[PDB]
Design a protein around this nucleic acid. Structure first.
Ligand code: FES
Ligand SMILES: [K+]
Ligand SMILES: [K+]
Ligand SMILES: [K+]
Ligand SMILES: [K+]
Ligand SMILES: [K+]
Ligand SMILES: [K+]
Ligand SMILES: [Mg+2]
Ligand SMILES: [Mg+2]
Ligand SMILES: [Mg+2]
Ligand SMILES: [Mg+2]
Ligand SMILES: [Mg+2]
Ligand SMILES: [Mg+2]
Ligand SMILES: [Mg+2]
Ligand SMILES: [Mg+2]
Ligand SMILES: [Mg+2]
Ligand SMILES: [Mg+2]
Ligand SMILES: [Mg+2]
Ligand SMILES: [Mg+2]
Ligand SMILES: [Mg+2]
Ligand SMILES: [Mg+2]
Ligand SMILES: [Mg+2]
Ligand SMILES: [Mg+2]
Ligand SMILES: [Mg+2]
Ligand SMILES: [Mg+2]
Ligand SMILES: [Mg+2]
Ligand SMILES: [Mg+2]
Ligand SMILES: [Mg+2]
Ligand SMILES: [Mg+2]
Ligand SMILES: [Mg+2]
Lengths: 71, 135, 184, 168, 215, 108
RNA sequence: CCCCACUAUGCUUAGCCCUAAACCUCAACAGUUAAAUCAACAAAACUGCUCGCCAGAACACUACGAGCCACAGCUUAAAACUCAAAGGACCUGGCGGUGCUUCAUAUCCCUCUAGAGGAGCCUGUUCUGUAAUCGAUAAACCCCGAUCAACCUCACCACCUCUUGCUCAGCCUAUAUACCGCCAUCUUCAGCAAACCCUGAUGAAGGCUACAAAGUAAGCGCAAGUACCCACGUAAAGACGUUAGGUCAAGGUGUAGCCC
């Protein structure tokens, strides 16, 4: 068979890889911001739990970890 | 008006039907003979198909009890230097003469195979037959 | 079969390559793609048959000592002769001796090919020296003899959509004796 | 074509051909059958062919199946009283199994005929209403009665538009 | 003179040629029949459309099929077959049902002499596949006499208009079996979901059972 | 699919039908913003009279004005209906001739 | 792309990353070879049963979300705007910086003889010029329509004149891409082909083997015959089709246009 469908996919992937290459510094700043909001959204979900259960502060000795950082 | 659809039924069925429908005004000369004396199988086109998997032809190999005696005789004594004459319908080869004596001695009550084969060779030598062992 | 097709309908037909068949063959007939394959395969057998005869000592002690090597073997499709190219040695005089021995042997070789009855109907075998070294042999023979002297956008409608009124003309309208002398 | 072997089983006509309508006592029917063995063949065909018909006629009876739990196949029925009915089905055909449980725990044809008659009392022919519940919607559909004004206009004397006009 | 000819397809075929480029030829499909069971079809090819008409119709009468008809008005049994990618499902129908079939099947049925039949064509609606698929299915229908001879039993027709009266339609010419045909409690026959969906009333289509001219 | 798979997946779910430029409505009222002509996509050649209108829904859209000759002007009221102009890419609305400020085409 | 040098890398060890045209492009298991063998090609056609998956193209191996030792990543994976197609297989044609094979007999190359290409002149065309025709115009135009222009010819230009006009008018006005007529061209070819028949499942298509296997073929061309000095040679002949090839300005003529 012909490879015309593969050729369409080939160009789409080449242009995408090149686009990501050109903007990899902007995309890295955007990704960093999303992970911060993701962490904040996670901390809120846990705070909602103890607050809806009648507690006024987090359980004694509980520190919400950073589960989205590269470290 | 007629039909050349040779793969649709048979010449008889196609002819009989078109005669009923009035398409053929007169019956062909052969129709009445076919009707009175039809073939064993109605000649209907069929496409020969190839066998696959566990399907095997029903034809069986033709063997006889004496074939065991013939195989041993050819192994021990080889084919006779006498030439087969397949034109004579009553031709008897040295192997056939051996087989007939072998059968006669078996009917006399002997049942051993190795013993029934050695006594047969002696009988023929007494009758003047040449039996040169191959080895 | 293989990607190379071998479903020939007349597969069982007996291949008969003889000089007589060519004269009764129809030149109007156009050779099949696989008709060449039968010729190509026969040529391979003729190569193997001659090549094997060449290396056996007994057939001709003169032939074996020469250690002749055949470059190619292509039978004529006419069937007149079996071309048998033999690689030419660099030694100029040895190309004549090898050639002379081959010509004498060739006559006996044809009978020896009848010993292998499958190849029995073999045409007269012809040996050809490879000109790569042989052509130069002729020149150098003359070269030494030679005297060199004292040295010093209109819309195109689809043909399938083209409108026709043949039916409209059909449906519109169904298309539209005694002889005597001295008649008065 | 319809998927599976014996697609007839997945038709409303087939499912309505069951003749086993359990008495109200029957609450649970367990089927213990074996996947292999010549003596359990009827029980396998019973599960294959008839369990769907039994369930269709008895939607509120729990039917639970159990494979290869015991050496022989059997049916066990649990009744509301607390009684249990063990039916050995080894060596019996699927048709005999259906006929057996019909005899011991199925409603007879008389009891079913009565129920069908009591249902006919619910749709009284003399009642008028929507076609869903009644044969006729209005008395105007009865021949001899004053037809509907939608089909035949009424005399001016029988219409309020003109009764008031004369009176006023 | 007893045969009528009907056109089923007229196509303009375009052949690319080595020296003359795209040339226009005509491929015609016509069916012939006498209305009494004898019918056939043939393809015609020519540069002119009227020469193709002559070839197909004249050729068709030399390749006639005979089609068996139940009571000279319908088929003997339901026929469901596929020819290549064209599926044809035909149903035996009573008198007065008419020809509720693909228009080409209607045309072919009038040439054969079938008056009452339902047919549904699914898959590829290729006129040629439909024509030869239809003739293949109509030529392989077993009559009641053939069924009686094959099974050595009576063929008994039960009609609801005649109540419980048993009407023997065919009896075996040879000896009559004494052993009843085995009564399989449940037949292992393959069913059409369209037929079952209809019988149950779950088949709702705005295009089915529409009022049409007499055919 | 198998019967078990057909059971587990259930009856097919139709895609929710896509509302067109009228948002599933027969006509919309619009205010003309500007008038202009559009070139049809090849092989067609013409200057098709179109306009941009603000629809009552708030969204602005290009609408084809059918007929020979119109007098539409900015700030005028028109009624627009569905129907794509086949040779004008992106033009999916049509002005109704004879409603509000858009009058009927003047004969010949 | 070709040549040289050298690095990451290909290796080991320990961790990652988790992709492939990861493809027999054939899901696992069981069964069948009788039915219809079968859209096509691939790889003979199917049945039972189960899981996975698919529902026009493109957007899209993308966006967002989530997960992940991944941080220019992987997995899962949409929508809006847009279109009437996209796509699969096969056939034919065209084309190939496409293979092989055998060829051209004044013939493609070399070989043979005399030329053209340089000079002057003659003549045609182009271009320029002029108030001042037209047509031909790669092979297949260019001493061509012309076996022929000082006037005439003549159809061109300028000026003047006539208006039922040499004609029961006239027009060399447009259209040879409406045509007849007469031709160029391959042709320094041998094929075209009605009417039938058969194969491919009655698909587009195809139809030859001489120890022959589905073709038969009227007619046309070639051939034969005739002309010239033979039976040789040279003429003549040369179909269908190719180039919407040439010619409306040989004449005629369709359509359109002019009529002080
Ligand atoms: S419905 Fe009965 S009066 Fe109208
Ligand atoms: K592969
Ligand atoms: K090609
Ligand atoms: K010169
Ligand atoms: K012409
Ligand atoms: K002219
Ligand atoms: K003219
Ligand atoms: Mg793209
Ligand atoms: Mg419209
Ligand atoms: Mg290194
Ligand atoms: Mg190593
Ligand atoms: Mg691999
Ligand atoms: Mg699996
Ligand atoms: Mg899609
Ligand atoms: Mg990828
Ligand atoms: Mg991605
Ligand atoms: Mg993301
Ligand atoms: Mg010169
Ligand atoms: Mg000129
Ligand atoms: Mg010109
Ligand atoms: Mg010109
Ligand atoms: Mg030219
Ligand atoms: Mg003058
Ligand atoms: Mg002059
Ligand atoms: Mg003039
Ligand atoms: Mg022309
Ligand atoms: Mg001559
Ligand atoms: Mg000539
Ligand atoms: Mg001639
Ligand atoms: Mg031209």
């Amino acid at each position: 068979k012909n490879v015309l469908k593969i050729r369409r996919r080939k160009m789409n992937h080449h242009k995408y890889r090149k686009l990501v290459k050109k903007t990899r510094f902007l995309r890295r700043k955007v990704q960093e911001g999303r992970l911060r909001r993701k962490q904040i959204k996670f901390e809120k979900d846990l705070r909602r739990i103890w607050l809806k259960a009648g507690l006024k502060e987090a359980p004694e000795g509980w520190q919400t970890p950073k589960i989205y950082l590269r470290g | 008006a007629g039909s050349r659809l040779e793969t649709v039924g048979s010449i008889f069925s196609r002819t009989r039907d078109l005669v009923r429908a009035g398409v053929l005004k007169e019956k062909p000369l052969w129709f009445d003979v076919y009707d009175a004396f039809p073939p064993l199988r109605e000649p209907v086109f069929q496409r020969p198909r190839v066998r696959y998997g566990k399907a095997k032809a029903p034809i069986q190999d033709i063997w006889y009890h004496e074939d065991r005696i013939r195989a041993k005789f050819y192994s021990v004594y080889g084919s006779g230097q006498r030439a087969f004459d397949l034109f004579n319908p009553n031709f008897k080869s040295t192997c056939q003469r051996f087989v007939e004596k072998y059968t006669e001695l078996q009917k006399l009550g002997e049942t051993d195979e190795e013993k029934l084969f050695v006594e047969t060779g002696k009988a023929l030598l007494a009758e003047g037959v040449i039996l040169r062992r191959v080895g | 079969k293989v990607w190379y097709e071998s479903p020939s309908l007349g597969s069982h037909s007996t291949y008969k390559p003889s000089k007589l068949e060519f004269l009764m063959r129809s030149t109007s007939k156009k050779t099949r793609k696989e008709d060449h394959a039968r010729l190509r395969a026969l040529n391979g057998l003729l190569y193997k048959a001659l090549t094997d005869l060449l290396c056996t000592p007994e057939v001709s002690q003169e032939l074996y000592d020469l250690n002749v090597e055949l470059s190619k073997v292509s039978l004529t499709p006419d069937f007149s002769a079996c071309r048998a190219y033999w690689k030419t040695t660099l030694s100029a005089e040895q190309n004549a001796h090898m050639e002379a021995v081959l010509q004498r042997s060739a006559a006996h070789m044809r009978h020896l090919l009848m010993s292998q009855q499958t190849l029995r109907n073999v045409p007269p075998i012809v040996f050809v020296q490879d000109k790569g070294n042989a052509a130069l042999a002729e020149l150098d023979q003359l070269l030494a003899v030679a005297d060199f002297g004292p040295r010093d956008g209109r819309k195109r409608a689809k043909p399938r959509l083209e409108q026709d009124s043949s039916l409209k003309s059909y449906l519109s309208g169904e298309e539209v004796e005694y002889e005597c002398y001295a008649p008065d | 074509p319809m998927k599976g072997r014996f697609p007839i089983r997945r038709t409303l006509q087939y499912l309505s051909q069951g003749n086993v309508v359990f008495k109200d006592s029957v609450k649970v029917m367990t089927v213990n059958y074996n996947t292999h063995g010549e003596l359990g063949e009827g029980a396998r065909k019973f599960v294959f062919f008839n369990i769907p018909q039994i369930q269709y006629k008895n939607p509120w009876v729990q039917i639970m199946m159990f494979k290869n739990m015991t050496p022989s196949p059997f049916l066990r029925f649990y009744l509301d009283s607390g009684e249990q009915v063990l039916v050995d089905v080894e060596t019996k055909s699927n048709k005999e199994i259906m006929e057996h449980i019909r005899k011991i725990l199925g409603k007879n044809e008389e009891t079913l005929r009565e129920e069908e008659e009591e249902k006919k009392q619910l749709s009284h022919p003399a009642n008028f209403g929507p076609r869903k519940y009644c044969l006729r919607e209005c008395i105007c559909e009865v021949e001899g009665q004053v037809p509907c004004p939608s089909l035949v206009p009424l005399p001016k004397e029988m219409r309020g538009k003109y009764k008031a006009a004369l009176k006023a | 003179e007893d045969f009528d000819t009907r056109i089923l397809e007229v196509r303009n075929v375009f052949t690319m040629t080595a020296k003359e480029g795209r040339k226009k030829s005509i491929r015609v499909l016509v069916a012939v029949g006498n209305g009494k069971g004898a019918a056939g079809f043939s393809i015609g090819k020519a540069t002119d459309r009227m020469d193709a008409f002559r070839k197909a119709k004249n050729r068709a009468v030399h390749h006639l099929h005979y089609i068996e008809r139940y009571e000279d008005h319908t088929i003997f049994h339901d026929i469901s077959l596929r020819f290549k990618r064209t599926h044809i499902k035909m149903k035996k129908q009573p008198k007065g049902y008419g020809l509720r079939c693909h228009r080409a099947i209607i045309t072919i049925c009038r040439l054969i002499g079938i008056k009452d039949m339902y047919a549904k064509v699914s898959g590829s609606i290729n006129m040629l596949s439909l024509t030869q698929g239809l003739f293949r299915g109509l030529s392989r229908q077993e009559t009641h006499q053939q069924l009686a001879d094959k099974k050595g039993l009576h063929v008994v027709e039960i009609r609801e208009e005649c109540g419980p009266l048993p009407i023997v339609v065919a009896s075996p010419r040879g000896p009559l079996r004494k052993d009843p045909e085995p009564e399989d409690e449940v037949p292992d026959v393959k069913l059409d979901w369209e037929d079952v969906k209809t019988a149950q009333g779950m088949k709702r289509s705005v295009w089915s059972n529409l009022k049409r001219a007499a055919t | 699919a198998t019967l078990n798979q057909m059971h587990r997946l259930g009856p097919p779910k139709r895609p929710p039908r896509k509302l067109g430029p009228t948002e599933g409505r027969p006509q919309l009222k619009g205010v003309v913003l500007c008038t202009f002509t559009r070139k049809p996509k090849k092989p067609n050649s013409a200057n098709r009279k179109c306009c941009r209108v603000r629809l009552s829904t708030g969204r602005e859209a290009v609408c084809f004005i059918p007929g020979e000759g119109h007098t539409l002007q900015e700030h005028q009221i028109v009624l627009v209906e569905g129907g794509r102009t086949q040779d004008l890419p992106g033009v999916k609305l049509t002005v109704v001739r004879g409603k509000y400020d858009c009058g009927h085409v003047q004969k010949k």
